[model samples]
Target: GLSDGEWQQVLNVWGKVEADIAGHGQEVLIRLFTGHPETLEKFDEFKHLKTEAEMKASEDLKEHGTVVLTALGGILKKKGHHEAELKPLAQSHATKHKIPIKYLEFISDAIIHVLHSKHPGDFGADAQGAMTKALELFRNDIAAKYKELGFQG
Candidate 1:
């Protein structure tokens, strides 16, 4: 649970990015793959994408990005009370997606990279702290669920 100030900061920073949710989400995924090429292998839809151009042009990539951002938006709007969503999401990743917990860490880093690079002024230390805490909470919960599902990695 975020404090009132933290919630406002998170929402404020999100407001700056949510208008272009698809584009920002796409950039986050692009940054994730660029920073960590190996993580790209986890995505069945995107594993075949080689060049950056191909990734950018990928509708599947964009659609997945949209889903990620949309879910994130829901979590933020709910002020991080996301047990219902997190359980299913982590289970799916563990069972079907086979995505390691480390990939979630990479995605968090990429999200911070996109936000800081794109909106430096709005996403300064204060907002960055709030956002990082929120993401950390998200990651910690997912990691716990993954362990519970017997997918430790």
Candidate 2:
């Protein structure tokens, strides 16, 4: 659902801050958990740290954001073409974490927003749509097998 130009626009803006993928990713998690505290149930290490400062202070939060941002960067590199990377991740969430794959859908929109002021000129509808789709692509792939989670797109 993303055009090449749209993807490039995403990359250009994301590239400026890509050096701190961990920080970006951590911001997402902090936003996700604090915004949707109910989702915190999935992470035993983070569920208790409801406040952003409390969560951000945790070493586990630091690394959790790293993994998320790393995988997220990979996902955007190929855009929807990289759905395969998330397949196993989906199953792991369903089987091991017992966390519904649906929760994955929240972080993107939650995150796309917080960056608006940081990169004020880059929030066009199409560009936002591209990033949102990339996140949904991962969520949808997981939904293929983990049918318990509702799909969003």
Candidate 3:
């Protein structure tokens, strides 16, 4: 149950970010999310909930925040926050959720794929490849997390 929620939230955030990026470039995308204090606050809350689920499920939540941040950082470089802004938000998420580092790496990789696909002229073969990679990574990570928590495959 917890894993389901966590996975959903992760996908929810991912989808939102993907759509935003695809529609309006990285700068606009990042601004839409981080420009508003409330948006960051909501993200923090969602991340906290996911982290809590991971802990309750006896799975590490350590790296998830890092994953979010790394993606944020990449996006920022192409569009939004300075390093300072990104780091704190990311750190706040990590601290609030208690995510493990390895999981963060996994999340970061997935985000990278999304970012690559959203870049202009980066679609067609590249987008197809990136989307495939991202989906595989997301699927594997979700599956592993589920398996670790004794979920049915």
Candidate 4:
């Protein structure tokens, strides 16, 4: 659903930040959990982290964040070819995890926040718009699956 110019902008910004996927990934999740502790409760793997220091220290949490960013990188690489990946992600999050679609949106915002704070010059308006549009598409795909799965609002 993204255009060539938008993809180029996203890829350009992603290229600049992809080098530190682990660090940036951890920070993205950290920002989310910090802003919405309730969301942190959804992650059984990380719910035990009572404080920011504990969350930072938990290898599991770091790895989970890394996995998220890695998934995003893979998505970006696909260049609008997400059906293979989206089906599984949508099914699991919808049927098994029962994650709210809003939380997915929250993560998207967290991602942008991390990118902007870390590299304002690289993640300027153009990059932000491109990334935001891409994220919206991802969320919408998942939301559609959620609806088809008979998930209730």
What Cα-based lDDT does every candidate model obtain? 0.87, 0.72, 0.40, 0.85
Q: What lDDT tens digits, residue by residue, belong to model 3 across residues 1-153? A: 123433344444445454544332333324333333233234443334332233333222224343544554354332222344445444543455444444434444445544555554533454344444444543444445544544431
Q: Which stretches of candidate 3 lie over 4 Å from their true place?
A: 1-75, 78-81, 114-153
Question: Each candidate's TM vs. the true structure?
Answer: 0.93, 0.82, 0.28, 0.94
Candidate 2 per-residue C-alpha lDDT over 17-90 given as tens digits, one digit per residue, 9 for 90 to 100: 58776777777787888888888887877778978889878878878888877777776787568657777777
- Lowest-sum lDDT 10-residue window in model 4: 119-128
lDDT of 3: 0.40
The pairs that clash in candidate 4 are none
User: Please, what are the lDDT tens digits per residue for candidate 4 over residues 1-153?
Assistant: 899999988888888667888788888989999888989888877888867788889778888888988888888878788989989988888888888888998899998888878886766787789999999998888888889988875
Candidate 1, residue 114: CA error in Å?
0.2
lDDT of 4 at 83: 88
Off by over 4 Å in 1: none
Greater-TM-score candidate between 3 and 4:
4
lDDT of 4: 0.85
Query: Judged by TM-score relative to the true structure, which candidate is superior, 2 or 4?
Result: 4
